[PDB]
Amino acid sequence: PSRLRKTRKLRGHVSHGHGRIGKHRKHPGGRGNAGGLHHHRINFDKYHPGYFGKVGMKHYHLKRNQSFCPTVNLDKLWTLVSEQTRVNAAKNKTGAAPIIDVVRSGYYKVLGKGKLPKQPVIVKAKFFSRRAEEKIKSVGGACVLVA
Amino acid sequence: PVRNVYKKEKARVITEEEKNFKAFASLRMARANARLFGIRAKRAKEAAEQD
Amino acid sequence: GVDIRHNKDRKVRRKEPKSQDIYLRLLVKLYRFLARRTNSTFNQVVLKRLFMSRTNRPPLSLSRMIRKMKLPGRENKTAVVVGTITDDVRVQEVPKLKVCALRVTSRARSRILRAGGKILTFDQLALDSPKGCGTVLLSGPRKGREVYRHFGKAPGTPHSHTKPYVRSKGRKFERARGRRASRGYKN
Amino acid sequence: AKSKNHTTHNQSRKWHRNGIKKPRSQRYESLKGVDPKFLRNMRFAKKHNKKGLKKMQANNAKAMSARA
Amino acid sequence: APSRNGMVLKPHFHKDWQRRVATWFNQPARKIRRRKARQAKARRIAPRPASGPIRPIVRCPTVRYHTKVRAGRGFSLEELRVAGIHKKVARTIGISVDPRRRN
Amino acid sequence: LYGTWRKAASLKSNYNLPMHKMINTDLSRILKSPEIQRALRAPRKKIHRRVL
RNA sequence: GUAAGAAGCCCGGCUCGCUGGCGUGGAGCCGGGGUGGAAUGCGAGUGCCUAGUGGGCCACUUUUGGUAAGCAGAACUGGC
RNA sequence: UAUAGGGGCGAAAGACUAAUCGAACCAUCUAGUAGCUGGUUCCCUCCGAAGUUUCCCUCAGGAUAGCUGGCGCUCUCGCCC
RNA sequence: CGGCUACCCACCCGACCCGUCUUGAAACACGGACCAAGGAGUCUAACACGUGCGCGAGUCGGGGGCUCGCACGAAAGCCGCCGUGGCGCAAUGAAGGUGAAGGCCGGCGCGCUCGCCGGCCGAGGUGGGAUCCCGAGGCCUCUCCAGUCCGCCGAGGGGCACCACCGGCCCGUCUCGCCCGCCGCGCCGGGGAGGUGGAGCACGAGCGCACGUGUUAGGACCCGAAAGAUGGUGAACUAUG
RNA sequence: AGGCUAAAUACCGGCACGAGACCGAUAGUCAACAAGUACCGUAAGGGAAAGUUGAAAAGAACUUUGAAGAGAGAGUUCAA
Numbered sequence A: 001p002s003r004l005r006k007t008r009k010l011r012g013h014v015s016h017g018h019g020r021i022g023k024h025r026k027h028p029g030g031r032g033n034a035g036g037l038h039h040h041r042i043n044f045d046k047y048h049p050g051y052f053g054k055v056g057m058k059h060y061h062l063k064r065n066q067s068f069c070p071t072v073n074l075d076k077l078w079t080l081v082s083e084q085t086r087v088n089a090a091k092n093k094t095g096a097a098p099i100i101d102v103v104r105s106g107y108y109k110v111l112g113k114g115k116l117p118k119q120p121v122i123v124k125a126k127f128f129s130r131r132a133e134e135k136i137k138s139v140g141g142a143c144v145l146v147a
Numbered sequence B: 001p002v003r004n005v006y007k008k009e010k011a012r013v014i015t016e017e018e019k020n021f022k023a024f025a026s027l028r029m030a031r032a033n034a035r036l037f038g039i040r041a042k043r044a045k046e047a048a049e050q051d
Numbered sequence C: 001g002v003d004i005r006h007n008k009d010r011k012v013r014r015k016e017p018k019s020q021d022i023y024l025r026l027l028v029k030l031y032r033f034l035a036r037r038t039n040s041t042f043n044q045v046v047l048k049r050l051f052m053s054r055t056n057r058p059p060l061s062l063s064r065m066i067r068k069m070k071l072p073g074r075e076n077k078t079a080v081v082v083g084t085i086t087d088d089v090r091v092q093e094v095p096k097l098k099v100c101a102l103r104v105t106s107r108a109r110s111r112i113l114r115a116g117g118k119i120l121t122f123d124q125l126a127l128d129s130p131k132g133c134g135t136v137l138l139s140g141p142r143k144g145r146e147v148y149r150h151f152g153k154a155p156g157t158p159h160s161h162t163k164p165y166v167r168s169k170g171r172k173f174e175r176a177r178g179r180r181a182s183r184g185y186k187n
Numbered sequence D: 001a002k003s004k005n006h007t008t009h010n011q012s013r014k015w016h017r018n019g020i021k022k023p024r025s026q027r028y029e030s031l032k033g034v035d036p037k038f039l040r041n042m043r044f045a046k047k048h049n050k051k052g053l054k055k056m057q058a059n060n061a062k063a064m065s066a067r068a
Numbered sequence E: 001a002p003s004r005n006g007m008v009l010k011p012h013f014h015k016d017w018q019r020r021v022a023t024w025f026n027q028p029a030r031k032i033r034r035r036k037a038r039q040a041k042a043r044r045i046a047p048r049p050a051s052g053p054i055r056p057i058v059r060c061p062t063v064r065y066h067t068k069v070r071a072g073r074g075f076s077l078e079e080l081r082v083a084g085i086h087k088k089v090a091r092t093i094g095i096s097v098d099p100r101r102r103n
Numbered sequence F: 001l002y003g004t005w006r007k008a009a010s011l012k013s014n015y016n017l018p019m020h021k022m023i024n025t026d027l028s029r030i031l032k033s034p035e036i037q038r039a040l041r042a043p044r045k046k047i048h049r050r051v052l
Numbered sequence G: 001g002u003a004a005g006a007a008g009c010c011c012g013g014c015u016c017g018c019u020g021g022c023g024u025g026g027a028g029c030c031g032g033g034g035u036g037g038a039a040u041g042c043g044a045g046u047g048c049c050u051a052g053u054g055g056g057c058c059a060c061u062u063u064u065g066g067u068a069a070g071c072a073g074a075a076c077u078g079g080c
Numbered sequence H: 001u002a003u004a005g006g007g008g009c010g011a012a013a014g015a016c017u018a019a020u021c022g023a024a025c026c027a028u029c030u031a032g033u034a035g036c037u038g039g040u041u042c043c044c045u046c047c048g049a050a051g052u053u054u055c056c057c058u059c060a061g062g063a064u065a066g067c068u069g070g071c072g073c074u075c076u077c078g079c080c081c
Numbered sequence I: 001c002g003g004c005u006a007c008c009c010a011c012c013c014g015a016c017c018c019g020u021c022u023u024g025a026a027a028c029a030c031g032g033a034c035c036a037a038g039g040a041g042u043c044u045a046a047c048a049c050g051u052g053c054g055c056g057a058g059u060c061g062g063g064g065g066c067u068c069g070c071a072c073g074a075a076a077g078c079c080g081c082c083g084u085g086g087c088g089c090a091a092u093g094a095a096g097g098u099g100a101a102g103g104c105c106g107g108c109g110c111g112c113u114c115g116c117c118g119g120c121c122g123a124g125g126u127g128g129g130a131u132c133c134c135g136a137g138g139c140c141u142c143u144c145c146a147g148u149c150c151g152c153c154g155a156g157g158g159g160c161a162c163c164a165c166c167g168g169c170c171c172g173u174c175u176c177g178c179c180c181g182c183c184g185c186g187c188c189g190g191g192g193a194g195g196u197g198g199a200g201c202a203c204g205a206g207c208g209c210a211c212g213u214g215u216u217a218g219g220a221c222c223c224g225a226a227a228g229a230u231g232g233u234g235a236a237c238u239a240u241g
Numbered sequence J: 001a002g003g004c005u006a007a008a009u010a011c012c013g014g015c016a017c018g019a020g021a022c023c024g025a026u027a028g029u030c031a032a033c034a035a036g037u038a039c040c041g042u043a044a045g046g047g048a049a050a051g052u053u054g055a056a057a058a059g060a061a062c063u064u065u066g067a068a069g070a071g072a073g074a075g076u077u078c079a080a
Ligand SMILES: [Mg+2]
Pocket: A013
């Protein structure tokens, strides 16, 4: 919207919002990231520290495809399966337990949080944190490794 | 041609000492065994070689 | 002139709500009338929070809206929120509590109606409590916004804990000079 | 092409344009910068206060409320 | 040139990008062309079904997508021999045949 | 094709009717209701103009 | 520069792996009791985004170099 | 008729090479770049400066701090303290 | 008769010709003879912040597909076993990798700067903190009695958001000591107490669209060079055979 | 270290075709018109200006001054 643009409002002022003394001409400092070490170090440092140098090993032909492991928390561990399932499976029937298979839900590694109630479940996954493993052992469930 | 298979296996009771046997340490033991498989074989070959 | 003091003519305030929502303007009219005709500072604060913006009305969560009622003294009071109350995927048990908010999400309304609670809007809140008796006025996590974690006196000079802007959080992006003592300096 | 080098004229006026501020608000002063042996005193004192203060302070509060 | 606290930007516009700007103004045009192509195929070619040959159940090679499943390319000659028909006879029946796919 | 607030749309997949911001929105009826006018100060209609 | 109070005084008790003749010292924690604590004026605190500026000059006074300058250079305040 | 541009030709002045020669002309790259001149288009209202710190092959410039504006938020007086 | 006014004239006072560079312009600083038309902060991508809307631990079809051949239809509508995918819900490490819940009660091993068994609570505490709750008390024309009535409050309590501090948890390193288990007892894994580094956790607030400002790269507010490269045209002037 | 092969893809040249929140004769292609035309340079090459009477010419018969250009009358037209 050029009618809401500032340019239509500044018609009449001589220097047009950029001063009579300073005279913004073309490029007074440089272009882009010019002078990262020489004369703009108080802006490259003090606003982006760490920008200059090498940091570690150089993994040639790295893919974001072998390290694929979406993590699931113990808060999210219940709601991968519906609440009707856990209620009608642990409504005082027997010592059975429903299986929450996170691989079908699309998650690989089960990590540990709070809020894991008394009703025990069996979790099938590829990786586990020992926090979540202790939480499942404390609530009385089981831990199954699949692949 | 998708046919997303639904293997349910829902109703089962928690069982015997597999629940006290399938702990976290199995993954770390398998990781250490995979990292130190061949070097132990080299040390066993050297133990058979050095008499 | 006359006044040797500096001129700060308009203080800070937003009187008219900048939103063009007709329903919000009707609620603004109703609670402005109640705020100037009831001497109820509850109606004063609810009128100011209706004047308040979209970002500064953060979404309440269902577990927080439970835990602020779980405190002793909030048995039959109604939780009033100027803002949205959303679902929480964490909790499993929901009490029989009463809600008075704007634009409660669908799963939250469904779980409150399954648990047996009563959701309202501000017109029924005004019909049930003009002075606002029996209400607990709640607010949400303003500082929990991701925008507020980039804000501080610096991004890195007394290490500052304040999250500099970068594309990809990982190796090779802003980790060498000023982030570790082996490459130059360390903050 | 010689220019003016350095001055502090029209500086205190710019300072007092915005009202020079004391930090003026530190209740429960910041604890970093204190002797680590004193920290090994105070943190262990705090966590054993969290552990073993219950029954003696409870009976003492009951006694002073009965005598008061 | 830089400013207050903002992200370091490196746009790839130093090369003469103004010549090669392919904007999809013919995107509904290609959509109507390809609709008429599929409809003309289904009319004039055969009472064979659209997307003619049958595709196999195929698992995706990764540690990422191997839980999922996919319509492959062809029926992997050992599989077609166990089914018991000739190769081009299968191709004319409507069986998609890939001689590369192992088992 | 759209539904009510009780059921979803049976033709569209995941659409519901939006929740209304005000349930009963007759502002004149609300301001003339006895529950509101029970809890008002007083109609103060004096002007109190400038005294020379 | 600092202080002119309720974030302050006073009393009673627990903890300490600090310290150590000593229930000695020192910090932390808990509970209780009393706000009328210099003058004048003022409603305050806080978060984000950003333009312009980055060539100055003059005057009372204190001053450096120069014989002096409508010369060059500093300090407080005011002005252009 | 032959020598055609960083080439020709010069009894040598860097002279001549189509009114242009210490590097011709025409077109393209090309709207080359410029911290450097000039200019920058309607009204009213409100607030309203700086020529200073530090750094830079920095001294006609820029970055940072300061001065400034805009957007709000948290509270408080409004009924012997 | 009245009449301000883009008509003219006179009179009194004030009044140097505009624009910019500049500390300073009416300047013996520069541009402007006059007039009409054209003429300078745009557009794309990216980012940040604020605002507005929809959905909200999710969000988005921008990529395709489906509708009968319709001017507006290059629109719009729908997909859901089209969510592949982008962003967010998890960070810390160079990496192998690891990866955020603790507290209380009772019994026991020497409650021993120490581990086990059963039950319970559950995102910890302190000081501030809008609002909210209980309520002493007194208040309505002449006698006790009452219910809403006119009508506030001493004092106390739970404490939103947010601020300060303490404490706890995760990851990488640092120091000190002890224990546990074996798909097989080893230069095997895991655990504990303190001190640090992190852009973390400590009940999550994001996604998409639009608008405003600012920055960056693109011709980038308009106009401006001495220069460099590529390919061709000239000895009809002149220089020389 | 020998070879063929349609599809989806690209198209600011060309042949016809349709539409436009675009410009409206100093704008839009250089060119709405005898436009790569007039014209310039030896040549490579450079390169314009220039639309509108009226509905229909019904474009003003005839008289008169002047050698004619040009007028004065008259006439056509809703209007010279
Ligand atoms: Mg101005």
